[PDB]
Design an enzyme around this catalytic site. Structure first.
Site, PDB file in Angstrom:
ATOM      1  N   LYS B  55       0.705  -1.079  -0.064  1.00 15.19           N
ATOM      2  CA  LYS B  55      -0.211  -0.232  -0.050  1.00 15.19           C
ATOM      3  C   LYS B  55       0.459   1.357   0.002  1.00 15.19           C
ATOM      4  CE  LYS B  55      -3.439  -2.834   2.767  1.00 15.19           C
ATOM      5  NZ  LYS B  55      -4.034  -2.734   3.607  1.00 15.19           N
ATOM      6  N   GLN B  99      -4.750  -1.081  10.409  1.00 11.95           N
ATOM      7  CA  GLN B  99      -4.753  -2.349   9.814  1.00 11.95           C
ATOM      8  C   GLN B  99      -5.292  -3.329  10.537  1.00 11.95           C
ATOM      9  OE1 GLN B  99      -3.136  -2.907   6.360  1.00 11.95           O
ATOM     10  NE2 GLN B  99      -3.393  -5.207   6.526  1.00 11.95           N
ATOM     11  N   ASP B 124     -11.192   2.820   3.731  1.00  7.30           N
ATOM     12  CA  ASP B 124     -11.956   1.802   3.598  1.00  7.30           C
ATOM     13  C   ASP B 124     -13.338   1.352   4.033  1.00  7.30           C
ATOM     14  OD1 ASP B 124      -9.275   0.315   3.140  1.00  7.30           O
ATOM     15  OD2 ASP B 124      -8.749  -0.761   5.190  1.00  7.30           O
TER      16      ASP B 124
END
Ligand SMILES: NC(=O)c1ccc[n+]([C@@H]2O[C@H](COP(=O)([O-])OP(=O)(O)OC[C@H]3O[C@@H](n4cnc5c(N)ncnc54)[C@H](OP(=O)(O)O)[C@@H]3O)[C@@H](O)[C@H]2O)c1
Ligand SMILES: NC(=O)c1ccc[n+]([C@@H]2O[C@H](COP(=O)([O-])OP(=O)(O)OC[C@H]3O[C@@H](n4cnc5c(N)ncnc54)[C@H](OP(=O)(O)O)[C@@H]3O)[C@@H](O)[C@H]2O)c1
Lengths: 285, 295
Positions: B55, B99, B124
């Site tokens: 990422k 995460q 997200d």
């Protein structure tokens, strides 16, 4: 020959009698505690005035204190926000709602208004937070809108398990269709959602073991389309008052059906009251 | 008449090149403006380190500034909450994510952590508030989770209009199936959602003009089930041993690709379909958050 009639008037009466006894018991456990609901209205629509009166009457019968605040048509978004903030902060108010649609001469962003409601007081379940929990299966700590909630209860009155059924929802509104889909899905139905761009609506409807219609299109869902033995839940209020389903034809095909009036409408008010009593009980923690 | 193959590797590479150009152009239109993404990690899991590096590298290639905050395994819930609050309030940070899963010696309520993310920075798309907006049709300004976002993009690459099609989603998870439903519905498909309690799954699947499968059940959806002419989008990443492969394992989908490719008009392979889209979609969501911030 005809479908069993799901009598929302009688069922809602049983619900309201149970809620009353629950409220009487809370008051005997904690004397002077009074569950409290507020309804904030903008403008002065005739239909909204009627619906609010029905809600106030059910509340007073159950022993819930109900407050009606009515703002004029000149109200701005910023004035509505101040009342919502005040209701959020008033610890005597356990649940409140904003009656929809807003009737103002000014543009008011309805979503922004609704989403200022504190989630623990959002007894209509229309905040994005509550919608988001429901839409993802977290029914644990979440208010569910009053109409789909009443529909689910009517479906359960048939005694037919929802799990594994093909359900069809005609309509996808925030208030009814979309949350209805979510309730059916997390009760383990396989769910198809239809709307104004659905092709071959008839063929989609015909797959429903459970059919919930919430379109506001008078009698558009024809009895011909209904699957034999289906449970038919009709949310429509269209002006006599008729449903979104052609009742006389649909009653010959369904096993269970809601009439209009006296079907979903009274059940909706009972669920609002149930959600209100829940908010009051949670606040006692 | 075999299916056209939707090449996710190529499509994602075009997306990342366009995002780069867009980011170069934003910076020239508003000099000193710097799109910025943060990733908050708890602990030191090997797999999380690998995903984060991928990422960060995509972001730096596009010209997005990417910050990695890595907290030790000793971290407590209340320290994670303080960082989230700080990211929410840092006006230089346009989007961030946490995460998952968290790697700590202490109990940390994951749901509560995620839901402290400010919705306007939730790239997200997994906060309840953002799920709620997406589920109720606010597609103009919510975030969409990266996998269903990439699925929609692949569907649109076919040039077949979605409106009025019967779409079937197999799976209803927070990360894929549920948001997938929402995207299809608000693009005006008629949508059926199936899951582990769906009866006659084969017969439901066979009604899909568009089919998205996200079950984690390797090759369960057989080619026979596929409607002729369907668009088939396969989110499955399932590992199977195969000594004939460079690393001794193959990746297969949730769809039996060899038979399904004879029935579909468009199909995603596995590997190389939905998977390579995912990091590009995160980058696209990051650029959206930066643009919305720019007013
Ligand atoms: N008893 C209660 O307390 C109560 C409360 C709420 C609603 N209701 C009643 O239930 C009905 C629905 O209300 P609502 O708030 O959900 O209304 P709404 O917001 O007008 O939405 C109507 C829905 O039906 C869809 N629709 C319209 N025409 C259609 C067609 N020909 N084919 C398929 N779908 C069609 C619309 O499609 P699009 O999304 O494509 O526009 C939309 O999703 C009304 O009669 C209302 O009075 C009753
Ligand atoms: N970056 C990537 O490439 C990426 C990202 C995300 C996901 N994925 C992949 O997509 C797949 C799905 O992941 P997920 O996160 O959605 O997983 P998940 O949380 O396990 O969800 C599985 C879903 O499929 C349903 N399902 C399972 N068995 C089924 C059956 N026999 N028939 C019908 N439905 C069935 C489950 O039904 P119930 O809800 O009834 O349990 C559930 O809704 C996995 O292979 C995953 O690795 C890939």
């Amino acid at each position: 020959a005809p479908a069993e009639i799901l009598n929302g008037k009688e069922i809602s009466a049983q619900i309201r009698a149970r809620l009353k006894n629950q409220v009487t018991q809370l008051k005997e456990q904690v004397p002077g505690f009074t569950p409290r609901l507020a309804i904030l209205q903008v403008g002065n629509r005739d239909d909204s005035n009627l619906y609010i009166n029905v809600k106030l009457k059910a509340a007073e019968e159950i022993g819930i204190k109900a407050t009606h605040i009515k703002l004029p048509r000149t109200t701005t978004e910023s004035e509505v926000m101040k009342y919502i903030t005040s209701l959020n902060e008033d610890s005597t108010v356990h649940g409140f709602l904003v009656q929809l649609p807003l009737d103002s001469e000014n543009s008011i962003n309805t979503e922004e208004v609704i989403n200022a409601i504190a989630p623990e007081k959002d007894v209509d379940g229309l905040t994005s937070i509550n919608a988001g929990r429901l839409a993802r299966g977290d029914l644990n700590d979440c208010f569910i809108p009053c109409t789909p909630k009443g529909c689910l209860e009517l479906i359960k009155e048939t005694g037919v398990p929802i799990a594994g059924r093909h359900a069809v929802v005609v309509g996808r509104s925030k208030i009814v269709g979309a949350p209805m889909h979510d309730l059916l899905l997390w009760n383990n139905a396989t769910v198809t959602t239809c709307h104004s761009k659905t092709a071959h609506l008839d063929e989609e409807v015909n797959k429903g073991d459970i059919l919930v219609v919430a379109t506001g299109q008078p009698e558009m869902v024809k009895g011909e389309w209904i699957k034999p033995g289906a449970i038919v839940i009709d949310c429509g209020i269209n002006y006599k008052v008729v449903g979104d389903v052609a009742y006389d034809e649909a009653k010959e095909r369904a096993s269970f059906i809601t009439p209009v009036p006296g079907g979903v409408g009274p059940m909706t008010v009972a669920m609002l009251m149930q959600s209100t009593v829940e908010s009051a009980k949670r606040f006692l923690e």
